[PDB]
Amino acid sequence: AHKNPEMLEEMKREAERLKAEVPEDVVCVVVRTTEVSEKKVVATAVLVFSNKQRTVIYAEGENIKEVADKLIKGLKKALKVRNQELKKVKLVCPYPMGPKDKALMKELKKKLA
Amino acid sequence: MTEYKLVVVGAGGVGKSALTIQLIQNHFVDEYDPTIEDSYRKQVVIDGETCLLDILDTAGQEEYSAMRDQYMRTGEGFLCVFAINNTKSFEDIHQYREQIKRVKDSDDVPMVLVGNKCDLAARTVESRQAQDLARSYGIPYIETSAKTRQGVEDAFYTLVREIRQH
Numbered sequence: 001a002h003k004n005p006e007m008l009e010e011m012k013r014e015a016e017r018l019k020a021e022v023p024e025d026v027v028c029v030v031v032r033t034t035e036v037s038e039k040k041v042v043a044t045a046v047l048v049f050s051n052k053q054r055t056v057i058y059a060e061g062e063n064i065k066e067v068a069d070k071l072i073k074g075l076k077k078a079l080k081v082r083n084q085e086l087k088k089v090k091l092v093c094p095y096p097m098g099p100k101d102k103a104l105m106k107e108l109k110k111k112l113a
Numbered sequence: 114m115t116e117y118k119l120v121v122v123g124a125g126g127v128g129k130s131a132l133t134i135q136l137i138q139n140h141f142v143d144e145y146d147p148t149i150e151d152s153y154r155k156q157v158v159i160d161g162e163t164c165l166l167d168i169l170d171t172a173g174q175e176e177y178s179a180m181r182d183q184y185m186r187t188g189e190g191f192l193c194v195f196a197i198n199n200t201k202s203f204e205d206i207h208q209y210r211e212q213i214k215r216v217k218d219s220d221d222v223p224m225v226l227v228g229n230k231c232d233l234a235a236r237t238v239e240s241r242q243a244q245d246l247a248r249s250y251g252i253p254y255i256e257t258s259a260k261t262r263q264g265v266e267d268a269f270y271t272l273v274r275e276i277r278q279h
């Protein structure tokens with residue numbers, strides 16, 4: 001469904017390749033959106049950090065703004081608890097950029113500085 | 114330095130993330146944030162030897178149970194955690210232990226049984242019950258509290274030492 005484990009594994013493998021490509025200090029994120037009904041926007045994010053560390057974050061919002069807020073909160077939490085700071089990031093949606101993937105990426109890149 | 118791959122598994126809410134965060138950051142989380150998969154790395158000195166502990170915090174919820182096979186194949190040591198104030202979580206340990214046993218294809222898998230939340234007085238799993246379970250598994254049993262840091266270092270370093278005996 002919206003929490004497909006095979007999907008998750010594909011996102012993690014992609015994010016591993018991304019981390020292997022770009023320099024180590026840059027965090028690599030892969031985000032996907034499921035538009036369950038209209039008040040059930042669910043966001044899945046896979047994050048790879050510098051010192052070979054990883055985390056998976058979810059958000060259940062009704063608008064893209066709430067989803068982005070929860071995403072950024074999880075990002076900051078997983079930075080602080082691993083004793084790391086934000087160097088740079090890169091967000092991709094591997095295959096189907098669709099109903100709300102592009103808008104979520106625009107909001108995520110907006111909430112950066 | 115020597116690298117030890119530890120995997121923290123158990124039922125949801127028993128405090129796997131709290132224990133791992135207490136070990137890594139010396140901080141206790143009072144918020145329940147359900148986990149899917151988290152990776153941490155920590156440089157420690159155990160018995161005079163410099164180790165890199167690669168700790169993998171797993172998801173205790175019934176969802177994301179298809180990801181068990183991969184990490185139960187990769188990890189070397191396993192912290193099986195239950196909550197002393199959660200009888201069902203204690204009853205859930207056997208399923209994780211059997212999954213690890215069948216995936217590893219070995220009865221001798223480095224494991225430590227961990228009774229978390231020992232700071233709480235609403236105890237429904239007595240120490241001797243978990244001791245009997247651990248004796249059946251032939252593994253150590255340690256009580257820990259992520260709130261007070263009690264037993265956290267003991268549990269993790271005992272898991273490392275159990276890995277050492279292989």
Ligand SMILES: Nc1nc2c(ncn2[C@@H]2O[C@H](COP(=O)(O)OP(=O)(O)NP(=O)(O)O)[C@@H](O)[C@H]2O)c(=O)[nH]1
Pocket residue numbers: 123124125126127128129130131132142143144145146147148149171172173174229230231232233257258259260261
């Ligand atoms: N009193 C007490 N509370 C604890 C202890 N460890 C964890 N908790 C409480 O238990 C709550 C849930 O802990 P958590 O680490 O998220 O459990 P979890 O195993 O990671 N759940 P999940 O598998 O779904 O991710 C925390 O918010 C915290 O308040 C402990 O040793 N003592």
Ligand SMILES: [Mg+2]
Pocket residue numbers: 129130131146147148
């Ligand atoms: Mg957790």
